[PDB]
Amino acid sequence: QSLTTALENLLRHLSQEIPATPGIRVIDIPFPLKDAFDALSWLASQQTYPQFYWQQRNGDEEAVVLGAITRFTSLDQAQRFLRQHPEHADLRIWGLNAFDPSQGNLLLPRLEWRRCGGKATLRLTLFSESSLQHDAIQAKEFIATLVSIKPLPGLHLTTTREQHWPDKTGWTQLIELATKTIAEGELDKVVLARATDLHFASPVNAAAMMAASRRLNLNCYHFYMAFDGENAFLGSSPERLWRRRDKALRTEALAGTVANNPDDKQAQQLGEWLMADDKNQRENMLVVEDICQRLQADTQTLDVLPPQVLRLRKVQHLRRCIWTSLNKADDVICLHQLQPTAAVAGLPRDLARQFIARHEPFTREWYAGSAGYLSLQQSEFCVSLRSAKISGNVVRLYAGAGIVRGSDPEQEWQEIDNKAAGLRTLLQ
């Protein structure tokens, strides 16, 4: 109903002048938040088929995009385009960067609904290499294809078949191989993952899994990409890759973990053991020093903030925030200096990555990549952790583990079932 009114308003802008000439128009319609608007299930209800949902971890900034005017296969390519339209420094491109940051799947959205705290805007962009007028007609057709909000079911779902990429033995050998390699010297840490394929009787409603995940994981970023009706990648991640506002850059070392506890007093106590334990404290510093080296050339002075414990559902994390000024506002420098995270790849990055490439018995794809948005004036991406790939009736779950000098196979298999269980519950 607040949507109905905003769409009618879009149709009036589409009915006015509009020249038959190349260019760009951005039509911003105020979207009143007297609220009732579940953007997620509005988006899931639609039948046009690149779809993207994103909410930043504080819960105050939230977007849904529908339809692609242009698709981008990399963030580098996305930025090159945005640089041609400085007159729209808030034109956002949404989506994913693969684990390999040089591959992406990002879109210039036809329709963007965005909320900041208490204000929302419904955004239609017109874009044409020859005729805005004729683009406007396609936008009208697109609007008429919009469908009413249908309620988002819960998930029953029992498993037809499960398959681990590394099963127990493969994992053992992999870990042994990883310890032996670090024992030779050279590298120091390798984050190895295991994919878990859950086959189901009928297709999996990906959006409904996103809604489940969002409800479970407070203080996380939420991201959901529907590539088409049968394929999606989604998750809920506590971790920020970067945030850029003009030249001001924020990133973080989130490494070192203890259990959370409901009794929010053992949770404080457990956090004050984390804060003081040497092993976890060092692990965190090695990550900050890695981030710092990875961006000293492109940056002024780096301020490392006092460490805090970030309390989540099952787990609590050592976080040390890193703030700085970029020599220039450039998101491919952020992406390529920060992605593969030490937390996600390992030791010397390239040695860790070569190892992952050769011996990890599956492709990570979007997992442990990046999700968010960019514009000239600002960007934010989270690390695509705690995530799943859906394909028809197959859900692939991902869980990684840091491997070092002394790591033990059995132990680390256990740590990985623990992470994977988090995702498994979203399917009941």
UniProtKB/Swiss-Prot annotation:
Give the encoding gene's name. Answer: menF
Assembly state and interactors? Homodimer.
Catalytic positions are K189, E239
Q: What HAMAP family does the annotation carry?
A: MenF
The name this protein goes by in its record: Isochorismate synthase MenF
Q: What does this protein do?
A: Catalyzes the conversion of chorismate to isochorismate. Can also catalyze the reverse reaction, but with a lower efficiency.
The answer to keyword Metal-binding applying to this record is: yes
Cofactor note, please? Binds more tightly in the presence of chorismate.
Annotated keywords: Isomerase, Magnesium, Menaquinone biosynthesis, Metal-binding
A single GO molecular-function term is: isochorismate synthase activity
The pH response of activity is noted as: Optimum pH is between 7.5 and 8. The mutase activity decreases sharply at pH 6.5 and 9 to about 20% of that observed at the optimum pH.
Q: What is its EC number?
A: 5.4.4.2
Q: Where does Mg(2+) bind?
A: E283, E415
Thermal effects: Optimum temperature is 37 degrees Celsius. At 60 degrees Celsius the mutase activity is completely lost.
- Pfam families with a match to the protein in the record: Chorismate_bind
**Catalytic activity, reaction form:** chorismate = isochorismate
Pathway field: Quinol/quinone metabolism; 1,4-dihydroxy-2-naphthoate biosynthesis; 1,4-dihydroxy-2-naphthoate from chorismate: step 1/7; Quinol/quinone metabolism; menaquinone biosynthesis
Q: What family name appears in the similarity comment?
A: Belongs to the isochorismate synthase family.
- After gene disruption, what is the outcome? Mutant produces only a trace of menaquinone.
| Biological processes, Gene Ontology terms | menaquinone biosynthetic process
